[PDB]
Amino acid sequence: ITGTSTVGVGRGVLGDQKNINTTYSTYYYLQDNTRGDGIFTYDAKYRTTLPGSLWADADNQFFASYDAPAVDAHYYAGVTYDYYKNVHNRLSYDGNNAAIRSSVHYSQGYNNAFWNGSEMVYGDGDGQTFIPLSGGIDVVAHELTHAVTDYTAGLIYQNESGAINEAISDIFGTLVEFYANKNPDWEIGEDVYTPGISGDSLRSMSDPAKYGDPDHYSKRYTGTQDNGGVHINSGIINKAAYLISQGGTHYGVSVVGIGRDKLGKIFYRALTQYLTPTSNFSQLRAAAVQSATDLYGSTSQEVASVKQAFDAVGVK
Ligand SMILES: [Ca+2]
Ligand SMILES: [Ca+2]
Ligand SMILES: [Ca+2]
Ligand SMILES: [Ca+2]
Ligand SMILES: [Zn+2]
């Protein structure tokens, strides 16, 4: 839409009030012109046809319960854009300020969110397992990071390369959550998962085995479900990333933590410079060691901690 940039106000899925960037042209649209070529949020109207209609509002106030998933999809896409720009010098997911598009109210009772190769898509959940999935900033940043991966390393979505793909999205989803300082943790999806149960989440990076995911390469899933375990074996890499950042002793191997900022720098360099579509876990280790070497030197603590973390999860 062509029109005038303005700022509206609304309430997100968790009931918090926030300001959002909109565009005025007869209606107020969820179109943010302040970031790249724009952030656009669409209403899929409980259907599966995409993208749906660009979100239009009569008064620039978004306090209806129907509005909430749109507010959060729109706002958290902006935060994720800001993260990649300010921290990694990356302009949107393609590096050239591509427009970011999201559709909310996808289908009925849909307990998931995804990047479809062109846009982000959020279900509303069924009210029991999930509430609308854009309510989690780690979820939004997880999905948008799939777009970054698609335009850089291109990791194919199966077997070890796919598990790496998933882990990269969990890792940067978590780093974005820390960047926004929104009650940050090392869990995935806790804000929108099981509204009736407190303290849980979909996945854990600190302790993947909490929810039955492997935390060591010896426990990797080798069958054919879930595209060869892409959401399962990501736990091995998530645990390694958690160890690099926070440290700890895991299966008797001790890791000195180097912090979240350096973890992000190492993995972003690995992703954008060294990983390829068919990279496996052992090539990820090599890429991460080389990235830390590039950034901090071959005799640094940083290189040593990357090596120890991968040793700890059994990835040689
Ligand atoms: Ca309104
Ligand atoms: Ca959190
Ligand atoms: Ca989280
Ligand atoms: Ca819960
Ligand atoms: Zn994913």
Residue numbers in the entry: 1 to 316
Quote the authors verbatim.
Examples are given of the equilibration of three different crystals to new solutions with exchange times ranging from 5 to 180 min. In each case direct transfer of the crystal to the new solution causes cracking, which is eliminated with gradient equilibration using the described device. Crystals equilibrated with the device produce high-quality diffraction that yields refined structures comparable to those determined previously.
For the lysozyme and thermolysin crystals, just a 5 min gradient was sufficient to prevent visible cracking, while α-lactalbumin benefitted from more gradual treatments.
